[PDB]
Design a protein around this ligand. Structure first.
Ligand SMILES: O=P(O)(O)O[C@H]1[C@@H](OP(=O)(O)O)[C@@H](OP(=O)(O)O)[C@@H](OP(=O)(O)O)[C@@H](OP(=O)(O)O)[C@H]1OP(=O)(O)O
Ligand SMILES: [Zn+2]
Lengths: 223, 137, 128, 111, 177, 26, 118, 215, 491
């Protein structure tokens, strides 16, 4: 793991292409300058719960606008068929990598928001909240299932595993043993924030395409 | 309590493991490598020589693998040279028990060792070649 | 007979409401094959470089020279998210008419046994 | 004596095992240990025979393209989950030189 | 690691004493605090003693708390029917939930029922303020072993021998006379 | 120390590409 | 030979009220109905019909509703022992059972019989 | 608890957290260094550390309601560490705030929170708190053959350093020098040598950076 | 392993899927092991089979085993069988009534909640014990008092990483009882768990006196007899296309041993010979006898492992009377052994020759309260080993009380099962007991038969082992004919 991290660090140093280009479009300012967005101050946990509710409602509106009543999106963002589907149903109800990527991204943010909801309800602890967040970030692989719709992720998955090994080795040196309670989540958190720096434009374009196929129609004239 | 084992299972398992190393390697040097990469108490270098011997003897026909492997061990340290002079002594004295194929393979094995000069040519001391003092075997 | 209250003050149940509910349908953490391998490796290191006592210490701890195989512990905290598989992979041509054009090469189960499915029972029951 | 053949054998044995995995629907190393590939067919395995579990000798590309230096390094062939020591086909086949000598001798004494 | 507790933690505890054994009620004194405060006060004044369980419905509910017994009396500690207090983690899907009985909106009085099974159509109509703890769920269940003469009244209704408060969550309870 | 041994990438070998020295060298 | 012995003692095993054992035999044979040795399959079918004769149609353990669909693909078997025993069993069922089956199953079997006339 | 600005749609459709997490680099590192100290003390001193369970809520529990469930509840003490008022005088008052000195126009630019300015008592206490997350070397001679240009050269020549990375080869007849009967072999030439002196021990060096330092 | 027509384009092409499907089934505990992680399971349609992964060949093999609602039928069949075992023991257990809850037709495979299956209403009251396992022995029926009792039946399908069935029993017991949606009729009951892919069973819960032994025997017999379990085992066999070679289904019967060498460790103990004495006549003519060393003799049948405690004469010193002393000494010795052994080697059952020794054992074994001690209804002539000169001379010439360890299955376990090896050993011991002389003669068949230094017994090939096995059975039957006046060709 040490030497895989050195390889990453070297390649980063090598591939530095300069800022090379420039424009600065300003999104939340264009939004706030409109009559349709307001502004306030909230508690981070409250905004997290709002965001999970709204992601749930958007994905359901999409499903039921497509009329797939035989499918059900549950509250941990798993999509499940409710019966067995005939052939025409199995065909009309396939979803693509845009829908499934938005699902699993929302699934990861829900897991993080609910670690905090437990700490705020009094159920766990500051130390157990930290250890649990660090668990989430080192194990995004088997909690969500993003990799099936973007297998390139396994690069972030391998990064967070390598950082886990580095940090545990330096943490559990002396009296401390090989048990759970190490929470140092700044590392894996960094890694997934860069993942999203990149995937956010991809998904904006893909989801624009899917919505514009939903609301105008499918153009076959000038393919 | 202090259960005193006399199933003799450590030696049986030693031999089993040595034989699987031999029959899984490709040349005598890859075999010597896996061996000197396993570690054991020096109580078993005697067993090392005698076992590589018997490994050789039970086969169907000769190939120089087992001779060269024992040769590499004796050429690394002396204890194998000691144990192989002893080996010839006792093998000859009790050879009358081998069916002629294994007897032939033992004979070839010792011929190979002697002409590679891993054994001292002294060891021929043992053949007091009277008529009485020697069985037909 | 009538059950006796304990006239207690604390609420019943797990404190922390399960927030840390451990998983167990597997063996005990002290006796799993991983723990046996750990013990055996410890005695191997203790014996490494000592001649044989001819003392018996268990089967798994013979003097193993050639420095895994076995069961695997699950995370005691991740709860695996279970889905129902509702598709029966049954040839509809065979089930209906007794004949498949694919024969031995059908990927699907050759079986004529018509029977209620796993969800129809739920459906008729809850509307019953 | 042909260190290019040993390479070929490791790669080819591994490709056919990989295709049995591909034919199922996973490549996960722990779902398909060696036992399921190497068990004889009388016990339900597939009964593979192996030459790709050996150590391949290596020494010094530079001097080696010139004078046959010998062996200094051993690279691994295929992966056994622990030692497991799978046997070779080569140790059960007998060399030609010894075959030719055995034959001359056997027919002489048959006469 | 498979089974989820899906309601908030309780605070306080009231012990009921009936013909059919005891009944330990744990109260949700933050989710419905008017109802819990009212129950606790009426139970500190012994207002619930020698009251009958004057209505039973098979596998739906069992009702009580009216000191008259006709099934339509009783009075809160606020001189008037008080309001509803709902929650989203409290909902009518199991047995052993204690709730405030009422005829309509804002009607909460002094009458309370237990459930004995899922009542999935009382949600957002009644206030849930308590649940029966483990071992005495079964005594409360036996409270519904009766032969119903119609109007769902029993032949020999059960009744509340005596009350007791095992932990009082409020500090400002002062009981009327 | 990579002294002319091991795959320049252990990609297409069907191995992990570990290299040890000949322990029976002398 | 063991499926023969069953077909012979199929009278005793019933008349002495073998419910465990007789249901045992019925459903075990139905499981073997997939045999790929014609000579073994013919005797399995003989045993099944020997049981159907003693314990009637409407209490056979694999109900006739599951038995007959299992047999209509066997009718294509072209081997003489299995063809013999199969059409004997289907004749019993068509004669006496005859309503645990669909009209479309019966028309299918019609079309499959038109080539046992060979 | 952290309170963040929000920009939300007039119909509830979406809500964006409208800010950027700016921090002072030595403060931040010192706060995590104290985190590390405390969490090791806890993993040591707890008897049985129970890791919570994932997912935290059922699949069919709708996401909680803030107003009903979390609004009033007290928030449960955090992982702060106990500073000693004797040595940590410069730091005691603002160490664990959200944005430590956000409003003190003497130490920060202003309320947009760029451009900090500290004194050396502060910086020394910060250093001492961050002491366990830091590297205890004073110079560059440690990274002698382990720096960038060493790894760039190693990559360009497709040779590996003992502890260093490996990559794919950058690209992928007879000779009269190489005659081995003419060679004087005293000490075997290793990859360290070929990397230290990439122009003398190397044929075809392309894109080779020249490592040397004696700092 | 399992020793024309006009056919369509596809039938003269495409692979044959049957042998693929059969390879997947046989290795399916490995191919479908739980603890190799993606964290997502899948539950098959109408069963309780979890698929960790997505392997359609495996899915179709398993889905063809459990076809036509065989999972619910196994559940309902076992429930019937238990209902009737209780309808027998009604009074002896003081049950007033036995009721069978109308089963939610999806109870058998729903796995996060459960009803109860059987409801026993008592006649008077039961003093019910605290939760414990089925194979744990010591109870104290003090805990609660109850009038109803429920019994629940849970079927699982294990796999390679997870097939411990006792842990599954207590897991589901605690989960389902402390769960809040669970609907039970009372606070007391038992959960019985059955592993269908390994044919194991266990249970956890509250016991009311008599219930534990009743359920032990009833479940041990349901696993052998049940028709639906038979239909299952035979669908498995038909899917693998496995066939037996041996007729007669070897001497397996509801005797205990085809059960005993199963994974639960089991010890045989022979302490009949702790005290031994031999006579020499003096110049008085008086025959004076001298004691000599004895031995407690402990045998693990499925590894062939024989511990032999040499009891030295010194304990004969002055201790008032010998026999009951030997009883208690033996017992404490056995306990010392079990302590010195590593925990993965410790027995669960011990079977004693002299059942009267169960009591002093029972006493000393309080250290190991779940080690059930039985008396043997299978007498094994383990003492006949005292004729084999190795054991005999070792014991005679011992100077010190001392523990030794031999292997009685020299190499046989390389190429036979522990079952066949136990049978062969029992023959050898019996014949060495019965005559010992013609037994030596049979066990040294040829002049060049030899025995190797670490070996108890001659080295024969499997052909000669078959022959000499036959000859020993003939020896035994001949001597039974002699000393019971029977024609043996008639039995
Ligand atoms: O649970 P896993 O994903 O398998 O990760 C574990 C684990 O880490 P987590 O705590 O994050 O679960 C261990 O670390 P400890 O918790 O036991 O300290 C341990 O690593 P160590 O044994 O080095 O602690 C183990 O490793 P192994 O595979 O040797 O069991 C492995 O970490 P990996 O990601 O390396 O597997
Ligand atoms: Zn088909």
């Amino acid at each position: 793991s040490y030497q895989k991290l050195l390889k990453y660090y070297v390649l980063n140093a090598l591939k530095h292409r300069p800022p090379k280009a420039q424009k600065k479009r300003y999104l939340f300012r264009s939004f706030k300058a409109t009559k349709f967005f307001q502004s306030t101050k909230l508690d981070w946990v409250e905004v997290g719960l709002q965001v999970c509710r709204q992601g749930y409602n958007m994905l359901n509106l999409l499903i039921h606008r497509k009329n797939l009543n035989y499918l059900h999106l549950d509250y941990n963002f798993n999509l499940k068929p409710v019966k067995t589907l005939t052939t025409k149903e199995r065909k009309k109800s396939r979803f693509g990598n845009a829908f499934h990527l938005c699902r699993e991204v929302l699934r990861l943010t829900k897991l993080v928001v609910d670690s905090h909801v437990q700490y705020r309800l009094g159920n766990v602890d500051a130390f157990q909240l930290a250890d649990g967040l660090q668990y989430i970030f080192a194990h995004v692989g088997q909690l969500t299932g993003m990799y099936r719709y973007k297998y390139k992720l396994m690069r972030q998955i391998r990064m967070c595993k390598d950082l886990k090994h580095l940090i545990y080795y330096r943490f559990n040196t002396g009296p401390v043993g090989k048990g759970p309670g190490c929470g140092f989540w700044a590392a894996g958190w960094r890694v997934w924030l860069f993942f999203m720096r990149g995937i956010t434009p991809l998904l904006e374009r893909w989801l624009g395409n899917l919505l514009a196929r939903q609301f105008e129609g499918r153009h076959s004239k000038g393919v | 309590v202090t259960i005193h084992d006399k199933t003799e299972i450590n030696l049986v398992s030693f031999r089993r493991t040595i034989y699987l190393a031999i029959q899984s390697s490709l040349d005598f040097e890859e075999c010597a490598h896996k061996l000197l990469k396993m570690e054991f108490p020096e109580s078993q270098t005697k067993e090392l020589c005698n076992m590589i011997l018997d490994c050789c003897a039970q086969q169907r026909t000769y190939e120089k693998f087992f001779g060269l492997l024992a040769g590499r061990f004796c050429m690394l340290k002396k204890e194998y040279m000691e144990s192989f002079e002893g080996i010839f002594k006792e093998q000859y004295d009790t050879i009358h028990r081998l069916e002629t194929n294994k007897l032939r393979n033992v004979a070839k094995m010792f011929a190979h060792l002697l002409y590679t000069d891993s054994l001292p040519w002294s060891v021929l001391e043992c053949i007091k070649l009277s008529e009485e003092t020697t069985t037909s075997s | 007979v009538v059950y006796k209250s304990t006239r207690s003050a604390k609420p019943v149940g797990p404190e922390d409401m399960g927030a840390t509910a451990v998983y167990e349908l597997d063996t005990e953490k002290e006796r799993d094959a991983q723990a046996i391998f750990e013990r055996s490796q410890k005695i191997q290191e203790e014996l490494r470089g000592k001649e044989d006592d001819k003392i018996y210490r268990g089967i798994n701890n013979y003097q193993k020279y050639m420095k895994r195989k076995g069961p695997i512990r699950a995370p005691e905290h991740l709860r695996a998210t279970v889905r129902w598989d509702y598709q029966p992979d049954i040839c509809k041509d065979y089930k209906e008419t007794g004949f498949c054009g694919f024969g031995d090469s059908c990927k699907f189960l050759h079986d004529r046994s018509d029977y209620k499915h796993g969800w129809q029972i739920e459906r008729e029951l809850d509307e019953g | 004596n042909t260190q290019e053949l040993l390479d070929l054998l490791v790669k080819c044995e591994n490709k056919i095992q990989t295709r049995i995995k591909i034919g199922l629907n996973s490549k996960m190393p722990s779902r398909f240990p060696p036992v399921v590939f190497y068990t004889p067919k009388e016990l339900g395995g597939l009964g593979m025979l192996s030459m790709g579990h050996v150590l391949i000798p290596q020494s010094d590309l530079r001097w080696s393209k010139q004078t046959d230096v010998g062996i200094t390094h051993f690279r691994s062939g295929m992966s056994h989950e622990e030692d497991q020591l799978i046997p070779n086909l080569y140790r059960y086949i007998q060399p030609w030189e010894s075959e030719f000598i055995d034959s001359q001798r056997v027919w002489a004494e048959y006469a | 690691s498979n089974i989820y507790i899906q309601e908030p933690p309780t605070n306080g505890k009231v012990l009921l004493k009936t013909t059919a054994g005891d009944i330990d009620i744990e109260l949700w004194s933050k989710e419905a605090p008017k109802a819990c405060r009212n129950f606790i006060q009426l139970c500190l004044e012994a207002y619930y003693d020698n009251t009958i369980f004057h209505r039973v419905v098979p596998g739906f509910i069992v009702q009580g708390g009216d000191p008259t017994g006709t099934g339509s009396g009783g009075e809160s500690i606020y001189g008037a029917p008080f309001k509803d207090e709902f929650h989203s983690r409290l909902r009518f899907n199991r047995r052993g939930l204690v709730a405030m009985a009422n005829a309509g909106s804002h009607d909460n009085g002094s009458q309370f029922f237990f459930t004995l099974g899922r009542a999935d159509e009382l949600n957002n109509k009644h206030t849930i303020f308590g649940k029966v703890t483990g071992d005495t769920v079964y005594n409360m269940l036996r409270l519904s072993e009766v032969d119903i003469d119609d109007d769902e009244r029993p032949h020999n209704p059960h009744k509340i021998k005596s009350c007791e408060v095992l932990f009082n969550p409020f500090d400002d309870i002062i009981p009327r006379e | 120390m990579y002294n002319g041994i091991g795959l320049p990438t252990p990609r297409g070998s069907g191995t992990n590409g570990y290299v040890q020295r000949n322990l029976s060298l002398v | 030979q063991a499926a023969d012995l069953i077909s012979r003692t199929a009278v005793v095993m019933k008349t002495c009220q073998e419910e465990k054992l007789m249901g045992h035999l019925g459903v075990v044979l139905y499981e073997y109905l997939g045999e790929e040795y014609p000579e073994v399959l013919g005797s399995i079918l003989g045993a099944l019909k020997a049981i159907v004769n003693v314990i009637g149609m409407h209490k056979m353990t694999p109900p006739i509703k599951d038995l007959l669909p299992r047999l209509t693909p066997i009718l294509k078997n072209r081997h003489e022992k299995v063809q013999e025993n199969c059409i004997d069993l289907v004749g019993r069922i068509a004669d006496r059972g005859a309503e645990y089956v669909s009209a479309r199953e019966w028309m299918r079997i019609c079309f499959e019989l038109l080539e046992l006339l060979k | 608890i952290r309170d963040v600005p929000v920009l939300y749609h007039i119909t509830g459709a979406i809500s964006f957290v409208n800010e950027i997490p700016w921090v002072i680099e030595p403060v931040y590192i010192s706060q995590w260094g104290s985190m590390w100290i405390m969490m090791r003390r806890e993993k040591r001193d707890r008897r049985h550390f129970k890791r919570m369970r994932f997912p935290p809520f059922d699949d069919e529990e709708p996401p909680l309601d803030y107003a009903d469930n979390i609004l009033d509840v007290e928030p449960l003490e955090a992982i702060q560490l106990e500073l000693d008022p004797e040595e940590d005088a410069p730091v005691l008052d603002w160490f664990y705030d959200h944005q430590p000195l956000r409003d003190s126009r003497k130490y920060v630019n202003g309320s947009t929170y760029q451009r900090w300015q500290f004194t050396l008592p502060m910086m020394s206490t910060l250093y001492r708190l961050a002491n366990q997350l830091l590297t205890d070397l004073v110079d560059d001679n440690y990274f002698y053959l382990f720096d960038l240009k060493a790894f760039f050269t190693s990559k360009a020549l497709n040779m590996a350093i003992p502890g260093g990375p490996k990559f794919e080869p950058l690209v992928r007849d007879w000779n009269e020098f190489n005659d081995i009967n003419k060679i004087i072999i005293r000490q075997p030439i290793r990859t360290e040598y070929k990397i230290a002196f990439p122009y003398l021990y190397n044929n075809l060096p392309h894109h080779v950076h020249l490592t040397w330092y004696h700092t | 392993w399992e020793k024309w027509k006009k056919l369509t384009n596809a039938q003269r092409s495409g692979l044959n899927q049957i042998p693929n499907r059969r390879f997947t089934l046989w290795w399916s505990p490995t191919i479908n092991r739980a603890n190799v992680y993606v964290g997502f399971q899948v539950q098959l349609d109408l069963t309780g089979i979890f698929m960790h992964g997505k392997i359609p060949t495996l899915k179709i093999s398993l889905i063809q085993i459990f076809r036509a609602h065989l999972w619910q039928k196994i559940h309902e069949s076992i429930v019937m069988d238990l209902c009737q075992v209780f309808d027998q023991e009604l009074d002896a257990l003081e049950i007033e009534t036995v009721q069978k809850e109308t089963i939610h037709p999806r109870k058998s495979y729903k796995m996060n909640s459960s009803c109860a299956d059987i409801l026993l209403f008592a006649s008077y009251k039961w003093n019910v014990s605290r939760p414990s396992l089925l194979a744990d022995s010591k109870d104290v029926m003090d805990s609660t008092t109850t009038q109803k009792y429920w019994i629940d039946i849970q079927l699982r399908w294990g796999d390679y990483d997870s097939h411990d069935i006792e842990r599954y029993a207590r897991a589901k017991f605690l989960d389902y009882t402390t769960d809040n949606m669970s609907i039970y009729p009372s606070p007391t009951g038992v959960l019985i768990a059955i592993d269908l892919a390994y044919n194991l069973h266990s249970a956890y819960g509250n016991w009311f006196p008599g219930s534990k032994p009743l359920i032990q025997q009833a479940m041990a017999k349901i696993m052998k007899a049940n028709p639906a379990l038979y239909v299952l085992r035979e669908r498995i066999r038909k899917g693998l296309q496995l066939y037996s070679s041996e007729p007669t289904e070897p001497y397996l019967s509801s005797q205990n041993y085809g059960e005993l060498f199963s994974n639960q460790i089991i010890w045989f103990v022979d302490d009949t010979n702790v005290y031994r004495v031999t006579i020499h006549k003096t110049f008085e003519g008086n025959l004076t006898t001298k004691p000599i060393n004895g031995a407690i003799f402990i045998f693990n049948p499925r590894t062939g492992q024989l511990f032999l405690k040499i009891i030295h004469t010194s304990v004969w010193a002055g201790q008032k009377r010998l026999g009951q002393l030997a009883k208690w000494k033996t017992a404490e010795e056995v306990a010392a052994l079990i302590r010195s052994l590593p925990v993965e080697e410790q027995p669960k059952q011990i079977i004693v020759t002299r059942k009267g020794m169960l009591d002093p054992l029972e006493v000393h074994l309080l250290d190991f309260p779940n080690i059930v001690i039985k008396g043997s209804e299978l007498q094994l002539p383990f003492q006949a080993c005292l004729k084999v000169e190795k054991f005999g001379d070792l014991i005679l010439k011992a100077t010190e009380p001392q523990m030794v360890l031999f292997n009685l299955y020299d190499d046989w376990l390389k190429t036979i099962s522990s079952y066949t090896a136990f049978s062969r050993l029992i023959l050898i011991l019996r014949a060495l007991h019965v005559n010992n002389d013609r037994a030596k003669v049979i066990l040294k068949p040829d002049k060049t038969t030899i025995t190797e230094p670490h070996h108890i017994w001659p080295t024969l090939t499997d052909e000669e082992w078959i022959k000499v096995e036959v000859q020993l059975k003939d020896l035994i039957l001949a001597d039974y004919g002699k000393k019971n006046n029977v024609n043996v060709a008639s039995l």
